[PDB]
Design a protein around this ligand. Structure first.
Ligand SMILES: Cc1cc2nc3c(=O)[nH]c(=O)nc-3n(C[C@H](O)[C@H](O)[C@H](O)COP(=O)(O)O)c2cc1C
Length: 116
């Protein structure tokens, strides 16, 4: 199955990417060496809704799952809608270990309705 996802380590500064799937690199047009060690906010750009970004920030803080749809950008500046799902991962002791983020490319929710 095709699967776009990245894994970050929130126990390192600014929650860097430590793994990115091959399909994620295909979707975003970045190479792995460009991405490792970066926060995934590099996919955002001028048309990204800051109110939606704030929902993600809150979800990270509370370590809760969240799904939002937002505009992201490829390396070449192509805009794509991203139905983005964030999932905390905990170790056996219940301590946060990783976050996984999964991206689905498509305008699933029409933008006029998303605007509401
Ligand atoms: C594992 C993971 C994957 C993420 N994937 C995306 C993504 O695909 N697109 C996106 O716009 N933001 C993504 N983010 C969110 C940004 O990295 C960042 O958390 C968000 O912009 C809010 O934090 P900031 O206000 O410090 O930028 C992801 C975050 C994590 C932890």
């Amino acid at each position: 199955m095709e699967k776009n996802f990245v894994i970050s380590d929130p126990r390192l500064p600014d929650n860097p990417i430590i793994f990115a799937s091959d399909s994620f690199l295909e979707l975003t047009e970045y190479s792995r060496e460009e991405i490792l060690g970066r926060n995934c906010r590099f996919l955002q750009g001028p048309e990204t809704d800051q109110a939606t970004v704030q929902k993600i920030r809150d979800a990270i803080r509370d370590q809760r799952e969240i799904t939002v749809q937002l505009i992201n950008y490829t390396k070449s500046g192509k805009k794509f809608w991203n139905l983005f799902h964030l999932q905390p991962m905990r170790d056996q002791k219940g301590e946060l270990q990783y976050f996984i983020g999964v991206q689905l490319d498509g305008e699933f929710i029409p933008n006029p309705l998303l605007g509401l």
